[PDB]
């Protein structure tokens, strides 16, 4: 079956997927679909789908919790997060990782922080501004993630990890916190959670040593999970299966 014909056939489902995506994500997946339509090989088409799947998934996951999709290329690394959010500790951070410079560059898909207080704005910037994904409370976002791991599967499809540093109630409304999130739509679920845990247990410790409260979440969904039991709401999972997973399924039948 001609990939342009498969893409003509599921164009409607795709357009529905795009309308529920954050604007930056929607645009990004429009290209990935035009690319899949115009592909030369099933080998090329397939690789675009692999990106279009995950790109769609993060756009959906970002939408479902009030967060903003950070396009892959402008996703902040750790060095930017520390430097932007915690300048005084930045020189101290640079030191601890001198033996592990690899920590410096880790880019959680979502790097969140609690809005703190103690139109006609500037809209154009010559250099990128390291984006600040602001959420109303890391704790309340953290609570909802542990609950869904214990009924009120999910306990098997995620990890929530927090660094043991103490923050007072004023210190939470005084100081910056870090919620780092990894999300996936891979087939091997326990892969997302354990691959990250190796690297990430060490990082929470190091953010603790430096006086940074930082909180972590990793989670995954797989095709075979019940639609009422994804990390994203069931009406969202409906569209992603009718669009992007339908699009792989036609691309495994022809390859």
């Amino acid at each position: 079956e001609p990939i342009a014909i498969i893409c003509d056939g599921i164009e409607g489902n795709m357009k529905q997927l795009f309308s529920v995506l954050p604007p930056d994500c929607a645009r990004e997946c429009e290209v990935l679909f035009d690319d899949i339509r115009n592909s030369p090989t099933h080998s090329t088409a397939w690789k675009h789908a692999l990106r279009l799947k995950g790109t769609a998934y993060e756009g959906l996951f970002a939408n479902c919790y009030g967060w903003q999709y950070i396009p892959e290329d402008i996703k902040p690394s750790l060095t930017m997060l520390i430097q932007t959010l915690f300048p005084d500790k930045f020189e101290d951070f640079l030191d601890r990782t001198q033996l592990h410079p690899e920590f410096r560059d880790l880019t959680p898909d979502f790097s969140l922080t609690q809005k703190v207080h103690f139109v006609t704005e500037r809209k154009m910037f010559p250099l990128p501004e390291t984006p600040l994904n602001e959420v109303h409370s890391i704790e309340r976002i953290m609570e909802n993630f542990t609950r869904l791991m214990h009924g009120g599967d999910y306990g098997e499809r995620g990890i929530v990890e927090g660094n043991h540093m103490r923050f007072s109630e004023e210190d939470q409304l005084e100081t910056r916190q870090l919620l780092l999130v990894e999300v996936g739509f891979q087939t091997d679920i326990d892969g997302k959670i354990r691959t990250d845990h190796k690297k990430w247990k060490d990082i929470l410790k190091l953010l603790e040593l430096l006086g940074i409260k930082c909180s972590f979440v990793a989670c995954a969904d797989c095709s075979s999970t019940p639609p009422d039991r994804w990390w994203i709401t069931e009406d969202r999972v409906r569209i992603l299966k009718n669009s992007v997973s339908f699009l792989f399924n036609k691309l495994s039948r022809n390859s």
Partner: peptide, 9 residues
């Protein structure tokens, strides 16, 4: 002076 992007200029 807080920008919607999370910065203060």
């Amino acid at each position: 002076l807080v920008h919607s992007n999370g910065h203060t200029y």
